[PDB]
Scaffold this active site. Structure first.
Site, mmCIF file in Angstrom:
data_model
loop_
_atom_site.group_PDB
_atom_site.id
_atom_site.type_symbol
_atom_site.label_atom_id
_atom_site.label_comp_id
_atom_site.label_asym_id
_atom_site.label_seq_id
_atom_site.Cartn_x
_atom_site.Cartn_y
_atom_site.Cartn_z
ATOM 1 C CG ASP A 168 -1.943 1.073 1.255
ATOM 2 O OD1 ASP A 168 -2.268 1.636 0.180
ATOM 3 O OD2 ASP A 168 -2.410 1.395 2.375
ATOM 4 C CG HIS A 305 -9.098 -1.001 -4.125
ATOM 5 N ND1 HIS A 305 -10.212 -0.646 -3.392
ATOM 6 C CD2 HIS A 305 -8.060 -0.315 -3.588
ATOM 7 C CE1 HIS A 305 -9.860 0.217 -2.455
ATOM 8 N NE2 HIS A 305 -8.556 0.427 -2.543
HETATM 9 C C1 HEM Z 1 -9.257 -2.164 4.252
HETATM 10 C C2 HEM Z 1 -9.641 -1.448 3.186
HETATM 11 C C3 HEM Z 1 -8.671 -1.125 2.034
HETATM 12 C C4 HEM Z 1 -7.611 -1.822 1.621
HETATM 13 C C5 HEM Z 1 -7.060 -3.141 2.206
HETATM 14 C C6 HEM Z 1 -7.018 -1.116 0.502
HETATM 15 C C7 HEM Z 1 -5.890 -1.468 -0.203
HETATM 16 C C8 HEM Z 1 -5.301 -0.731 -1.206
HETATM 17 C C9 HEM Z 1 -4.113 -1.117 -1.930
HETATM 18 C C10 HEM Z 1 -3.358 -2.431 -1.684
HETATM 19 C C11 HEM Z 1 -3.833 -0.169 -2.828
HETATM 20 C C12 HEM Z 1 -2.667 -0.173 -3.837
HETATM 21 C C13 HEM Z 1 -1.518 0.723 -3.363
HETATM 22 C C14 HEM Z 1 -1.510 2.043 -4.088
HETATM 23 O O1 HEM Z 1 -1.886 2.068 -5.285
HETATM 24 O O2 HEM Z 1 -1.106 3.047 -3.481
HETATM 25 C C15 HEM Z 1 -4.837 0.860 -2.692
HETATM 26 C C16 HEM Z 1 -4.904 2.021 -3.406
HETATM 27 C C17 HEM Z 1 -5.843 2.998 -3.271
HETATM 28 N N1 HEM Z 1 -6.977 2.955 -2.463
HETATM 29 FE FE1 HEM Z 1 -7.397 1.466 -1.120
HETATM 30 N N2 HEM Z 1 -7.776 0.017 0.266
HETATM 31 C C18 HEM Z 1 -8.799 0.045 1.190
HETATM 32 C C19 HEM Z 1 -9.786 0.996 1.263
HETATM 33 C C20 HEM Z 1 -9.918 2.102 0.460
HETATM 34 C C21 HEM Z 1 -11.024 3.040 0.472
HETATM 35 C C22 HEM Z 1 -12.216 2.936 1.443
HETATM 36 C C23 HEM Z 1 -10.780 3.991 -0.448
HETATM 37 C C24 HEM Z 1 -11.625 5.230 -0.810
HETATM 38 C C25 HEM Z 1 -12.967 5.189 -0.791
HETATM 39 C C26 HEM Z 1 -9.515 3.676 -1.055
HETATM 40 C C27 HEM Z 1 -8.899 4.426 -2.016
HETATM 41 C C28 HEM Z 1 -7.708 4.133 -2.615
HETATM 42 C C29 HEM Z 1 -7.035 5.012 -3.531
HETATM 43 C C30 HEM Z 1 -7.447 6.420 -3.985
HETATM 44 C C31 HEM Z 1 -5.806 4.263 -3.958
HETATM 45 C C32 HEM Z 1 -4.752 4.771 -4.951
HETATM 46 C C33 HEM Z 1 -5.311 4.518 -6.348
HETATM 47 C C34 HEM Z 1 -4.456 5.145 -7.411
HETATM 48 O O3 HEM Z 1 -4.010 6.316 -7.266
HETATM 49 O O4 HEM Z 1 -4.225 4.458 -8.436
HETATM 50 N N3 HEM Z 1 -9.030 2.507 -0.518
HETATM 51 N N4 HEM Z 1 -5.706 0.494 -1.687
HETATM 52 C C1 LIG Z 2 -6.360 2.515 0.365
HETATM 53 N N1 LIG Z 2 -5.681 2.816 1.242
#
Ligand code: HEM
Ligand SMILES: [C-]#N
Ligand SMILES: *[C@@H]1O[C@H](CO)[C@@H](O)[C@H](O)[C@H]1NC(C)=O
Length: 439
Positions: A168, A305
């Site tokens: 992450d 995601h």
């Molecule tokens: C336990 C819950 C969550 C887990 C395990 C999770 C996990 C991850 C992982 C593994 C990444 C990839 C790392 C990265 O691209 O920086 C990521 C990216 C991201 N997540 Fe989550 N996430 C969770 C909840 C959320 C929620 C609730 C939101 C917003 C509603 C969110 C928004 C984002 C955003 C904006 C990115 C970067 C996407 C990008 O710029 O390409 N995440 N998340």
């Molecule tokens: C998604 N942190």
């Protein structure tokens, strides 16, 4: 514009990036005494963006930032409308809109008793605890701690990974107005996407709100053995490169759901097999935009995601509006061999999720409702994208396209991420803490 880095709470712009973090949720008992304490506490303890970008030798042993809820500001006689549509009513009042099962929320988040949060970051429990005690000692009876949630980076080579196993903290927007490194594929946005009152912010802000930000805090419990069992039970049989063993198909299915392999390698660049070297290289691991896969799902599902929360070229070009900063930390113990074998969660673990934006409804809330929860987002696709499998909340939780060789197959995914509570906070500028909040 030149951002005053010494005046901006550091977690907003830079991120604490510490191994341990504690969130101390409090209510104000005595506004006058709280304000008196704040005037000595802030200059000594509240960590600016400037401190976070300094050499480690110039940094304190722990960092502290501080946010207030609407009821916290009201309790302190800070009555000016901050111009955000969601902040005033608090997150519990908004939880149904987000898709939350309200029955899973727990005290003290089930209302608006929380007035604020101190966030303390440190690389060690000892220092975390000492700075926590320093808050208790400084503020005394002027506050009551209503909850403390503590997190920690995962051990060893899992440091920086969340509990499902995925790296992450790879992709963050970069704001103009200061001198920083920008990686290939990184969004560059005006500072007011993140900082209230700056260029790009369209909300109506009091002058004293300049260089603050809104935090969307979410306490998520994660169901790790369940996630693992699901990927094994639904392991993808083959991809373009050839047949997959069950273990390979399970790993691949997890990567298809996230849009990245556990190593951080984005599937748009590495669509058939992990590339751990790519995942670990910030010069390459963000250099994609879905332009090679706008109208098919072989390289990446429409509903993965990262694609749902940052659609990149799915929006037709760069868009400033819906970017946000994240500064989350895992919590809880590692998942044991017995737990994984049983397929059943036996211990409390998950993510203390923190997302910053100037307009709550354009950052966290847009990503959640308009995108993740929206079966027909991204728009204009040849196959219905479905519900984002990780945090999409719409039922049935059906997502298409996870199997690149059978893209019309739909997957109904159990919810593995359970919201246990959350709140919307405003983090003022450092000067605002003492000149306005503590006035
Ligand atoms: C336990 C819950 C969550 C887990 C395990 C999770 C996990 C991850 C992982 C593994 C990444 C990839 C790392 C990265 O691209 O920086 C990521 C990216 C991201 N997540 Fe989550 N996430 C969770 C909840 C959320 C929620 C609730 C939101 C917003 C509603 C969110 C928004 C984002 C955003 C904006 C990115 C970067 C996407 C990008 O710029 O390409 N995440 N998340
Ligand atoms: C998604 N942190
Ligand atoms: C791929 O798997 C199928 C079963 O799904 C099998 O019939 C075939 O022989 C396999 N191909 C190779 C090259 O191993």
């Amino acid at each position: 514009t030149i951002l005053p880095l010494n005046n901006i709470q550091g977690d907003i712009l830079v991120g604490m990036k510490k191994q341990k973090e504690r969130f101390v949720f409090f209510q104000v008992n005595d506004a006058t005494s709280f304000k008196t304490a704040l005037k000595t506490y802030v200059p000594e303890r509240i960590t600016s963006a400037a401190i976070l970008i300094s050499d480690p030798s110039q940094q304190p042993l722990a960092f502290v930032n501080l946010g207030f809820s609407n009821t916290g500001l009201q309790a302190l006689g800070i009555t000016d409308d901050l111009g955000d549509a969601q902040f005033p009513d608090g997150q519990f009042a908004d939880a149904a809109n987000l898709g939350d099962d309200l029955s899973q929320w727990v005290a003290p988040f089930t209302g608006t008793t929380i007035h604020g949060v101190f966030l303390i970051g440190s690389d060690q429990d000892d220092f975390l605890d000492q700075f926590t005690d320093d808050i208790s000692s400084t503020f005394g009876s002027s506050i009551t701690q209503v909850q403390a949630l503590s997190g920690s980076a995962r051990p060893g080579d899992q440091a920086g990974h969340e509990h499902f196993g995925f790296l992450d903290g790879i992709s963050q927007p970069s704001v103009t107005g200061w001198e920083t490194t920008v990686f290939p594929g990184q969004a560059v946005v005006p500072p007011g996407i993140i900082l209230t009152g700056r260029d790009g912010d369209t909300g109506t802000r009091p002058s004293w709100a300049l260089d603050g930000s809104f935090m969307a805090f979410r306490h998520f419990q994660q169901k790790v053995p369940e996630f693992n069992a699901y990927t094994l039970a639904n392991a993808i049989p083959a991809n373009s490169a050839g047949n997959l063993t069950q273990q390979e198909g399970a790993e691949f299915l997890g990567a298809r759901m996230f849009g990245r392999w556990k190593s951080g390698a984005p599937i748009d660049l590495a669509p058939t097999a992990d590339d751990p070297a790519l995942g670990a290289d910030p010069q390459r691991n963000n250099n994609f935009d879905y332009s090679d896969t706008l109208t098919d799902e072989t390289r990446c599902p429409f509903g993965a995601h990262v694609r749902k929360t940052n659609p990149r070229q799915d929006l037709g070009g760069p868009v400033d509006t819906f970017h946000a900063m994240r500064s989350s930390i895992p919590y809880g113990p590692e998942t044991s061999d017995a737990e994984l074998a049983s397929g059943v969660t036996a211990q409390d673990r998950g993510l203390l999720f923190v997302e910053y934006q100037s307009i709550i409804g354009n950052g966290f809330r847009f990503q959640q409702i308009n995108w993740a929860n929206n079966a027909n987002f991204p728009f204009s696709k040849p196959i219905t994208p479905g519900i984002e499998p990780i945090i999409g909340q719409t039922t049935p939780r059906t997502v298409g396209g996870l199997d690149p060789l059978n893209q019309n197959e739909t997957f109904t995914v159990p919810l593995f991420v359970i919201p246990k509570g959350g709140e919307y906070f405003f983090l003022p500028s450092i000067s605002a803490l003492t000149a306005t909040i503590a006035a």
